[PDB]
């Protein structure tokens, strides 16, 4: 009614919980490799859910695969920074119901660190009050907002894909949101949006540094994750790829 059908198709395609199958004493491996994990089965949703994003399936397979390959770390932390803010108002990063991690579960500093960089988002979630309508436009451009430098093959596609969704979101906007602060509304979440590129580089350093140093570190990476990871995070870590800003 209110709603318009686009966001509540949306809801209805997102995935529906996904355990990590941790079982809780955690070492530094263990957690990562049960973080790994759970990156293995989201990534599998990742997959379904595009198969039912409407206009995804209509951009040549390559172009697909390559979209997936791009944003799935920016997915995966964008959605783990929903649940946060759904669940644990923030206070946590709630990886999944079975992986929970507060403060005293992150003891090595760099892992810390890690989780102070991913705590960015829901915390902007709470500030924001981002709500559920956005934050799944929101995700579709995240999907939307790399692509190779050379561009994609289904170019004129994806572009009108992305200007679909664009307009979704200010829809989305005008459910709550006054012409002015519905603008200033969607400076605010596209910003967000191009701020997450630089967050998400310090997530990939850290992958790709730990999938290296995996048998040494004693971690596992499961077979789906550790081809995302070689087949393009060393390209996308040099820079070999185009960033899609909507500020400059
Ligand atoms: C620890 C670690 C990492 O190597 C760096 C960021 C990490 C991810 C952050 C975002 C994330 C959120 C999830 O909900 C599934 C699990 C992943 C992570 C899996 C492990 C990653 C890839």
New binding site residues.
């Given amino acids: 009614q209110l709603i318009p059908p686009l966001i509540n198709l949306l809801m209805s395609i997102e995935p529906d919980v996904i355990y990590a199958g941790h079982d809780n004493p955690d070492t530094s491996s263990s957690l990562?490799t049960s973080?790994?994990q759970?990156?293995e089965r989201?990534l599998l949703s990742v997959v379904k859910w595009s198969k039912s994003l409407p206009g995804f399936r209509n951009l040549h397979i390559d172009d697909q695969i390559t979209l997936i390959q791009y944003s799935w770390?920016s997915l995966?932390?964008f959605?783990?920074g929903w649940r946060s803010y759904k669940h644990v108002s923030g206070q946590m990063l709630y990886?999944?119901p079975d992986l929970i991690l507060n403060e005293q579960r992150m003891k090595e500093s760099s892992?810390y660190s890690?989780c102070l960089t991913?705590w960015q988002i829901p915390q902007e979630f709470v500030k924001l009050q981002v709500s559920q309508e956005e934050f799944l436009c929101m995700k579709v451009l995240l999907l939307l907002n790399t692509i190779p430098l050379e561009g994609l093959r289904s170019q004129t596609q994806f572009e009108e894909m992305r200007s679909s969704y664009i307009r979704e979101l200010i829809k989305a906007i005008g459910l709550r949101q006054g012409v002015v602060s519905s603008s200033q509304r969607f400076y605010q979440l596209t910003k967000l949006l191009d701020n997450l590129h630089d967050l998400v580089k310090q997530?990939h350093l850290?992958?790709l540094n730990?999938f290296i140093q995996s048998r040494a570190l004693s971690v596992e990476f499961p077979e789906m994750m550790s081809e995302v990871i070689a087949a393009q995070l060393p390209k996308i870590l040099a820079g070999m790829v185009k960033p899609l800003l909507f500020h400059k």
Wanted: charge should be neutral; aromatic fraction near 16%; include cysteine.
């Fill in positions: 990562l973080l790994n759970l990156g989201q770390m995966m932390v959605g783990l990886f999944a892992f890690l991913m997530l850290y992958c730990t």
